[PDB]
Amino acid sequence: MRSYPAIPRIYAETTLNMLLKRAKKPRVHSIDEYLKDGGYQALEKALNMSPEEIIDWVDKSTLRGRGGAGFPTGKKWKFAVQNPGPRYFICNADESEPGTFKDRIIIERDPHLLIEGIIISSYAIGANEAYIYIRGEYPAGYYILRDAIEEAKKKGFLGKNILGSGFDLEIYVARGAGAYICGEETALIESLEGKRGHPRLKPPYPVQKGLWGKPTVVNNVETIANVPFIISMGWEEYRYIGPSDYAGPKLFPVSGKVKKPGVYELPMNTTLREVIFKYAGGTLGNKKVKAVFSGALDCFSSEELDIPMDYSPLGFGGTGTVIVLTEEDDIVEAALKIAEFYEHETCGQCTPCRVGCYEQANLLEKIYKGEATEQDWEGFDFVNRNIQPTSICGLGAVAGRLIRQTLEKFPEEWEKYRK
Amino acid sequence: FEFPEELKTKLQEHINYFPKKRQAILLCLHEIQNYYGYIPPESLKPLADMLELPLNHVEGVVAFYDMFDREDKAKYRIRVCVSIVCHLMGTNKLLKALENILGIKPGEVTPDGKFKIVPVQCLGACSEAPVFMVNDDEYKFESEVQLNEILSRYT
Amino acid sequence: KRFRGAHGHYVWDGTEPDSLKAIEKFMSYEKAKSRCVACYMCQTACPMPTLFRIEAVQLPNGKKKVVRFDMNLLNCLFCGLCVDACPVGCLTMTDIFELANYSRRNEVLRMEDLEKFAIDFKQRRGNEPDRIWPNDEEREKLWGKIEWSG
Amino acid sequence: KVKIYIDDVEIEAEKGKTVLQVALENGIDIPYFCYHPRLSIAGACRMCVVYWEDINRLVISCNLPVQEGMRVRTHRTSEMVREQQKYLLQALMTRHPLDCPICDKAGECDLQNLGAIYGPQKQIVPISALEKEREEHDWESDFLEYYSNRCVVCYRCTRACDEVVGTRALYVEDRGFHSNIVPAVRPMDTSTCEMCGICVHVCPVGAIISKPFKYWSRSWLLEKGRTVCNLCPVGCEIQIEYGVGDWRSKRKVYRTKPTDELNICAKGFFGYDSINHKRLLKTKVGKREETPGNVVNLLTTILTEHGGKTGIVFSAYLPKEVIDEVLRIAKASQAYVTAPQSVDLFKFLDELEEYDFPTVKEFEKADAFVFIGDDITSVATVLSYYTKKKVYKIGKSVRDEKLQPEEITYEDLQNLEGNVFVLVTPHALNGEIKEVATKLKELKREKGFKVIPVPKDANALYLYEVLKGIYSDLPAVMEACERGDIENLIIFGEDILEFYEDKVFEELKEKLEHLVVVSPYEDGLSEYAHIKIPMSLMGENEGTYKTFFGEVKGKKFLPWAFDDLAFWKYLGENFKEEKGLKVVKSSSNLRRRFEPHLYRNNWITQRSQNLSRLYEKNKDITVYYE
Ligand SMILES: Cc1cc2nc3c(=O)[nH]c(=O)nc-3n(C[C@H](O)[C@H](O)[C@H](O)COP(=O)(O)O)c2cc1C
Ligand code: SF4
Ligand code: SF4
Ligand code: SF4
Ligand code: SF4
Ligand code: SF4
Ligand code: SF4
Ligand code: SF4
Ligand code: FES
Ligand code: FES
């Protein structure tokens, strides 16, 4: 289509002008504008390099995955080319964690930056078939990607013998249908095979046996958008962006009680306090910050605002999601929304999570309504602390993480709910 | 039960697009649901035949994903985000407005079958909370009057 | 109140425990009739199972109906193990003890009898509290006025 | 081949096995739900957690292959494992109802057993017994009932339906806490489901219930025995659960179960009631019970003085030992011997001249399968659980469609290549018996295919081995009765009713001097007899059968059993020297009166009240897949 569905005007700001160079403006940037802006030249440079060199530059760039696990991209690619092909490359555009809207502004505004990164990466691991798995609730992004891919094929960037390099590639776009678990590497692959989204037991890992049991690489949209910059700038040049260890630009979706909610492109040495007050404009009504929710994973209190937004132990971590809560917001009520979220997304494959998430949310609901008894409390604790040990995947492993942290950082607020 | 030509062609495009037919199952279920306003249980066998898949496989898939609806028929699904950020910014105000305009609560569908309110998890537009969708279009809730003008554009 | 007398079958009167009400949907019962669901826990727990005789059927509507429940008190230990095993609050020991009779046959309780015993026991001492003895005048002959306390 | 440690105890384990397998083999009980030795590994219940010291992490043992020198710890020496067992069992019990008093699984329930041994011992998550709900849908079946709140979603049923039976009749309805099992097509009783009861048996709890068994008893009040199922030629080993007539349970068969090999079909699972139906358990003369010794004298007189005018109609539902004794007596009486299988099976095997009869285990060696004749899944059902290679077909195809068979022609067989197993059902060749046998005989010599005859009756192949060259044609025997050449008939079972209608025997009772019927039932063909002699059913005799699972020997444990073999052997004490035989042959073509069906394949399953309901619903259906 040439007229896409309606999407909100998400505000975007940047201090590096790399990933949001074009995405800072709320509109589609088609191939003609992207080319005038220098697009696809990084792909031609990469195609004049061997696949092994490209993997090497990505490893030396020290780029880590922006999907939440922080695994080093270059090493993931090296693991995949350890086994014989055919190989597959998958772009993970599921993006369904609460407060995370960073990937959509790239897809909806600069799809060619993502397409170029997919091509370079596919060439690097020797994948002639690449997939983009985008959540079902992103219809504009779906049509936009489909059309941008068609523009690329017309210009010769996709298809057979790309730019005379002998390299063949086709990018298929898959749509989800409402499941946060499909963002999990193996569940996505299962969904891509036309099955229910249940995560697989690992080992094996997808880099050895993934889509159709063949070596598959799954990378987050943000991670891939970095690949064109790594080739274009050179790996050495890229590594100097930000702190020595956590290099590269990073997208931060800031939401909640802030004046300027939106996506911010900043270096990972920035502190959470700088993110909220320096870039997002402070809090609404200038109310005091009570807590910050790293998506549905972590909970930071007002006493932890001076930490770096990196992948270090004492750092923010996660995917950079910043949900700001002020002094008039109820933590218990907030935890309930989190509990309801995990109950709604547990896939149901394994016991600790299938039942833990449901009973955790039901118990917290009784606590919140004031109908909780002493055994209800003891039971709430028991469940919250035992969902993770035997869970199969990351969902069950963190379904009680944030709620537990609010119990330790805001005990006074929780005891206000005891009879 | 047979698929009308218009819908059958769309389904064939998806089935021929992917390298393997079964990979088109989610796009086909979307196509069916957008055509009939719901996924008629009577279409799973015809779809499973086009994909060369056993019926129980197709049934298991359509049962797993949240967007698919085999019970209620609605021309427009009003997906309302009830997750943390939108809840903090006014999801309740939006639901109350939807009730004042259409007389329905989450999960219900108007008598003529025009609208159905569907509560959903984070829609990925938290910076523009409260968010809601009208089948494919995403909007920010501003006021009851504003919501009424937006809803008047459908039917 | 804790006397282990003649057995009885508590009846469907509205004061049933959560466990029985939870399975009521599966039973074919009548108001003011035995609560028994024929689980065989009493007889299985009993060291003398031969004294029991329980029978239940599956009605054509799918519900379960108890059709026979007999106990021979002359081979009973009056031990109370069966009441412990009743998961539905049906089997109980009443205060009935004047059962001497002229034939082994008069010492065999049928379901109809178990119901009548329990109905009468509940009718006369259901709200009575769990005390060491229920009447002090009958005990005064031997003990006298006892200085009770809270 | 590999040494490991479980709670610091050295244990030798064959490489390729899992820690859970090794532990169970060595008597180390580790609680588990979703692992089943016959199904693929699932790793979903997580109840089999063990602490793997080598990696300092909790791991599921059902998926942990043994490695040289590995060290694991179970709940015996690990509190971490103990805490997770209590949590997992408590989680399962959260919405599990207080249904034990009326649930059919009580006493043999994995949740009830494990929950009492490793569970929380008290309620930690306080849920009222009145709020024990989970999403649920009626299976719309008269035989199976699903209780989703009792379900501990373990996926054993789904795996068994897809990997063992292959019918693909179940699916998991909407995800998460409320994941519930639903039949792919409802009403279930006429869907692709073959009502084999395997889902009932693999279910670790009372989630999937057998309606015929509901509320009639309690699992711990029944007796148990294992024997050979003789309802078809496969030879499955099944377990009969029965009562004796004491305080625990009535003197009858209450239900039946497969073993952990999951070798069972609907006939074997729901046909148990044919054992209780109108049994003939005493020798009778007319309508009056008579002592066996007196009946033995009558028969001794009949065969000694009138053997040359006596015909014996064998049943393929007789064990080898009885067949042999009767045949030996016949050869001592100069009688006529036949079997209804002489109409089709014997004519075919006579032309084929040499066949193959490998065990089910040997089916692994085949590259492809060719089904010729009837619907194999309706004749020897369990065989369809082992024909997992390419399947070609010539003939009727109804339930066999689950194997996605490719239709071919006899001319195409010449081009197949490599270790082909041809499974042919002679009762379905209608006039092309000799032609088909001749064609397969060429194929067996030129290309070397395996030609395996699939009889529809349990011991028909042994009957053929022992009767070849000397059997009379069934129509010739009947024709000889009308002519008066045969004055006495000893008929075993009702196999004969597949070719002649009842009226024929009502008239034969008048025409014959002696009509002796050897049957397990007081109704049917035995109603027309002058002398009725009991015939044993499964679990009532120690007889061997030549089946697809080998030469299997049954066990005698049902207490009301009539000693079939002892009676015949006693009669045989009056016959020592071999006198001869008489053979009658005739070209008249007898047509089978009815086609076997998955739920009714012989006169025994016909007397099953359960299978009769299933048969009446599906008798007209001919298409289940498309
Ligand atoms: C419950 C769950 C949800 C996830 N969701 C996403 C997601 O929405 N987007 C994403 O890129 N990765 C998601 N992941 C992480 C993927 O498993 C995987 O680690 C990542 O996509 C790999 O790409 P990367 O190396 O570039 O980070 C999720 C993981 C879990 C356990
Ligand atoms: S932990 Fe939760 S999401 Fe992960 S497999 Fe288990 S049930 Fe599914
Ligand atoms: S234990 Fe109770 S419910 Fe069970 S059979 Fe005995 S009296 Fe009836
Ligand atoms: S009182 Fe003791 S001996 Fe008598 S029936 Fe009960 S359990 Fe058996
Ligand atoms: S499934 Fe087991 S634990 Fe649940 S009610 Fe039945 S017997 Fe009891
Ligand atoms: S009983 Fe057997 S055939 Fe029927 S649904 Fe269960 S596994 Fe499938
Ligand atoms: S019905 Fe039984 S076998 Fe099937 S998932 Fe539930 S507990 Fe497991
Ligand atoms: S396949 Fe034959 S032997 Fe096996 S259970 Fe069924 S009827 Fe019996
Ligand atoms: S929370 Fe409503 S859109 Fe993310
Ligand atoms: S038995 Fe190992 S996970 Fe279920």
Swiss-Prot record, chain A:
SUPFAM superfamilies of this UniProt entry? Answer: Nqo1 FMN-binding domain-like, Nqo1 middle domain-like, Nqo1C-terminal domain-like
Give the cofactor note text: Binds 1 FMN.
PROSITE patterns listed in its UniProt record: COMPLEX1_51K_1, COMPLEX1_51K_2
| A GO term, aspect molecular function | NADH dehydrogenase (ubiquinone) activity
Task: Kindly report, in one word, the top-level EC class recorded for this enzyme.
Answer: translocase
Task: State which Enzyme Commission number(s) the record gives.
Answer: 7.1.1.-
Binding site residues for FMN: 176-223
What is its cofactor?
FMN; [4Fe-4S] cluster
Keyword Iron-sulfur listed: yes
Q: Which reaction does it catalyse?
A: a quinone + NADH + 5 H(+)(in) = a quinol + NAD(+) + 4 H(+)(out)
- Which top-rank group of organisms is this from? Bacteria
Q: Which residues bind [4Fe-4S] cluster?
A: 347, 350, 353, 393
Keyword flag Aminoacyl-tRNA synthetase: no
User: What positions does the entry give for NAD(+) binding?
Assistant: 65-74
Sorted keywords for this record are: 4Fe-4S, Flavoprotein, FMN, Iron, Iron-sulfur, Metal-binding, NAD, Quinone, Translocase
Q: What does this protein do?
A: NDH-1 shuttles electrons from NADH, via FMN and iron-sulfur (Fe-S) centers, to quinones in the respiratory chain. Couples the redox reaction to proton translocation (for every two electrons transferred, four hydrogen ions are translocated across the cytoplasmic membrane), and thus conserves the redox energy in a proton gradient.
PANTHER family from the UniProt entry: NADH-QUINONE OXIDOREDUCTASE SUBUNIT F
Q: Which family does it belong to?
A: Belongs to the complex I 51 kDa subunit family.
* Name of the protein: NADH-quinone oxidoreductase subunit F
Organism name: Aquifex aeolicus (strain VF5)
Please spell out the taxonomic lineage of the organism that makes this protein. Bacteria, Pseudomonadati, Aquificota, Aquificia, Aquificales
Swiss-Prot record, chain B:
What family classification does the UniProt entry report for this protein? Belongs to the complex I 24 kDa subunit family.
Q: How is the cofactor bound?
A: Binds 1 [2Fe-2S] cluster.
Which PROSITE patterns did the record assign? COMPLEX1_24K (PS01099)
The protein's GO terms of the molecular function aspect are: 2 iron, 2 sulfur cluster binding; metal ion binding; oxidoreductase activity; quinone binding
Spell out the SUPFAM superfamilies in the cross-references.
Thioredoxin-like
Q: Name one GO biological process term.
A: respiratory electron transport chain
> Does the record bear Iron-sulfur in its keywords?
yes
NCBIfam families in UniProt: nuoE_fam (TIGR01958)
Give the catalytic activity. Answer: a quinone + NADH + 5 H(+)(in) = a quinol + NAD(+) + 4 H(+)(out)
Q: Which organism is it from?
A: Aquifex aeolicus (strain VF5)
Q: What is its EC number?
A: 7.1.1.-
- What's the name of the protein? NADH-quinone oxidoreductase subunit E
Annotated Pfam families: 2Fe-2S_thioredx
The UniProt function text for this chain reads:
NDH-1 shuttles electrons from NADH, via FMN and iron-sulfur (Fe-S) centers, to quinones in the respiratory chain. Couples the redox reaction to proton translocation (for every two electrons transferred, four hydrogen ions are translocated across the cytoplasmic membrane), and thus conserves the redox energy in a proton gradient.
The Swiss-Prot or TrEMBL record lists the needed cofactor(s) as: [2Fe-2S] cluster
**CDD domains named among the record's database cross-references:** TRX_Fd_NuoE
* Keywords, alphabetical: 2Fe-2S, Iron, Iron-sulfur, Metal-binding, NAD, Quinone, Translocase
Per UniProt, [2Fe-2S] cluster binds at 81, 86, 122, 126
Enzyme class, UniProt record, top EC level: translocase
Please tell me whether the keyword Iron-sulfur is annotated for this protein: yes
Swiss-Prot record, chain C:
The record's keywords, sorted A to Z, are: 4Fe-4S, Cell inner membrane, Cell membrane, Iron, Iron-sulfur, Membrane, Metal-binding, NAD, Quinone, Repeat, Translocase, Ubiquinone
Residues the entry annotates as binding [4Fe-4S] cluster 1: 36, 39, 42, 86
Cofactor(s) annotated in UniProt: [4Fe-4S] cluster
Assembly notes: NDH-1 is composed of 14 different subunits. Subunits NuoA, H, J, K, L, M, N constitute the membrane sector of the complex.
GO annotation, cellular component aspect: plasma membrane
Q: What class of enzyme is it?
A: translocase
This chain's protein is named NADH-quinone oxidoreductase subunit I
The membrane spanning regions, by residue number, are none
Q: What is its main location?
A: membrane
**Domain of life from the UniProt record:** Bacteria
GO MF terms held by the record: 4 iron, 4 sulfur cluster binding; iron ion binding; NADH:ubiquinone reductase (non-electrogenic) activity; quinone binding
Q: What does this protein do?
A: NDH-1 shuttles electrons from NADH, via FMN and iron-sulfur (Fe-S) centers, to quinones in the respiratory chain. The immediate electron acceptor for the enzyme in this species is believed to be ubiquinone. Couples the redox reaction to proton translocation (for every two electrons transferred, four hydrogen ions are translocated across the cytoplasmic membrane), and thus conserves the redox energy in a proton gradient.
Bilayer disposition of the protein: Peripheral membrane protein
What subcellular locations does the record give? Answer: Cell inner membrane
Cystine pairs annotated here are none
